[PDB]
Amino acid sequence: NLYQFKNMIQCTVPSRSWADFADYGCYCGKGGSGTPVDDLDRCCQTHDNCYNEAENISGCRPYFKTYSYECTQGTLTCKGDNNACAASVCDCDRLAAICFAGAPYNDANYNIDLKARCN
Ligand SMILES: [Ca+2]
């Protein structure tokens, strides 16, 4: 669920307030369209697409599904007790959190005008 994803980000990118990733570029947060503005945005684009795929699973709601995971000693793990939905969503989140940690953060891309720039 979003709460867990937030924690994944706090654990892979402790150096940033998690909210820095909640409204960035065309895909990080609300946004879900247009040309990804940079690498970080590209991280979010695959994350968004990943969620759209997971939603194909019956009763699978990525923002809400509580999965089983651990963040310990610099490592994020999706646990084996996860059902298909939980496993899928957890993986989307895990991969995005890791992707975020390796992407440059450009303040200029925070809170951009979606209507104008993400067509
Ligand atoms: Ca999004």
UniProtKB/Swiss-Prot annotation:
Cofactor stoichiometry and binding remark: Binds 1 Ca(2+) ion.
InterPro entries in the cross-refs: PLipase_A2, PLipase_A2_Asp_AS, PLipase_A2_dom, PLipase_A2_dom_sf, PLipase_A2_His_AS
Gene3D superfamilies reported for this sequence: Phospholipase A2 domain
Swiss-Prot/TrEMBL cofactor(s): Ca(2+)
Tissues showing expression: Expressed by the venom gland.
CC annotations in GO: extracellular region
Annotated localization: Secreted
Domain of life: Eukaryota
EC number: 3.1.1.4
A Pfam family: Phospholip_A2_1
Keyword tRNA processing: no
Signal peptide boundaries: none
GO biological-process terms attached to the record: arachidonate secretion; fatty acid biosynthetic process; lipid catabolic process; phospholipid metabolic process; positive regulation of fibroblast proliferation
Active site per the UniProt annotation: H47, D93
Residues where Ca(2+) binds: Y27, G29, G31, D48
Reaction equations catalysed: a 1,2-diacyl-sn-glycero-3-phosphocholine + H2O = a 1-acyl-sn-glycero-3-phosphocholine + a fatty acid + H(+)
Entry keywords, A to Z: Calcium, Disulfide bond, Hydrolase, Lipid degradation, Lipid metabolism, Metal-binding, Secreted
Top class in the EC scheme: hydrolase
Function: PLA2 catalyzes the calcium-dependent hydrolysis of the 2-acyl groups in 3-sn-phosphoglycerides.
UniProt record similarity statement: Belongs to the phospholipase A2 family. Group I subfamily. D49 sub-subfamily.
Protein name: Acidic phospholipase A2 3
